[PDB]
């Protein structure tokens, strides 16, 4: 298919996410993240990990 | 949970996605179907 | 000489010697092209140490040179990794051949 | 037992990792305005599946 | 020439599953949803339940390990941008109940 | 009891595959003609290559 699938204007292909707060206990630690997708985008969440 | 009853509602038993959808959704689902999977989104529910 | 003559035969076995490859159009582009990839001007497949941030599978293999490869060969990656089926895997395949060390 | 003998292990640092397919716009906004009537919702089993 | 009396023994070994019972008729697998759990006596009313197992004696302390097999079911809605909401079902054994 | 302060290495080996790269928009094969290929480049055009 010639047209109507890929854009045009830059964008990204892999994203990568910062913690925005880290906490620390002996037997485990919480991580926290402010995830972000904006418009015109759909992402699957099969290809998330840590 | 009131409009549609409890089992018939997360699709238990009942219709599968091949009729409950607008169909401009199914249109789409069957037009990019070799290069952006759909159809393990959605329950077809069966019953003996 | 004498021994197997990969040119003809099909045995390569030097692949793991290329650092990066750099492609570029008419002296002032660049076709993967609008930021698309992480290190967007040029392909990157192996990394010295401080690239220890973009390694996948336990390597030294860049994330995106195995995505693209993982694509290019089987149409998978936009959906999360995880092993083809055996049909669509033939013998001189990627996923066949792929080692960690 | 391991907690007995002397293993450790220690954690440093933590990123994220996401991946989307470049749609073209006009197609992703149509799947957006499709994908939120409430009958078009999303249904979602768990193999085992028991308790 | 010289063989001595002698008997037998037979034993098996089955490592690495589970033993099944279905909750069928006639046990078969007709459908994802058994015919029986919709027969009417067991969805109009209320029963209690007994079971009893005799197992191989052994020498230190052991779990018996149940799964009932059950429906298991989550519905997820996004109607505006930056909004989600979901509901949980499982049944039987609801969210509520031993 | 005692082993030595060690360090690590690490590396790869695929002998017996090419290692290719698609002509697409979005590296997958769609198809064998390839979206920017279609473009003919508006069938119309030219370049060197570097």
Sequence with gaps: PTHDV?????????????????????YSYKARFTLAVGDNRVLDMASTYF | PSMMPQWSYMHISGQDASEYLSP???????????????????RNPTVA | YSGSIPYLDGTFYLNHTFKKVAITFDSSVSWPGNDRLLTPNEFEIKRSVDGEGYNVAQCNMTKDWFLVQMLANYNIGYQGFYIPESYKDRMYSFFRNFQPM | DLRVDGASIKFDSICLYATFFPMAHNTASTLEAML????????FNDYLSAA | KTAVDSITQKKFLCDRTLW???FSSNFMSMGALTDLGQNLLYANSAHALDMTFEVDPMDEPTLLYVLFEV???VRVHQPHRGVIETVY???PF???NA
């Design chain 4, 36 to 43: 939120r009537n409430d009958t078009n919702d999303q249904s």
């Design chain 1, 6 to 26: 890929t854009t045009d204007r830059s964008q990204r292909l892999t994203l990568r996410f910062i913690p925005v707060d880290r906490e620390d206990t002996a």
């Design chain 2, 24 to 42: 401009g959704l199914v249109q789409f689902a069957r037009a990019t179907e070799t290069y952006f999977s759909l159809n393990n989104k959605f």
């Design chain 5, 94 to 96: 609801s969210a509520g």
């Design chain 5, 89 to 91: 079902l499982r049944t």
């Design chain 5, 71 to 73: 429906f298991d079911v």
């Design chain 5, 20 to 22: 099944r019972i279905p």
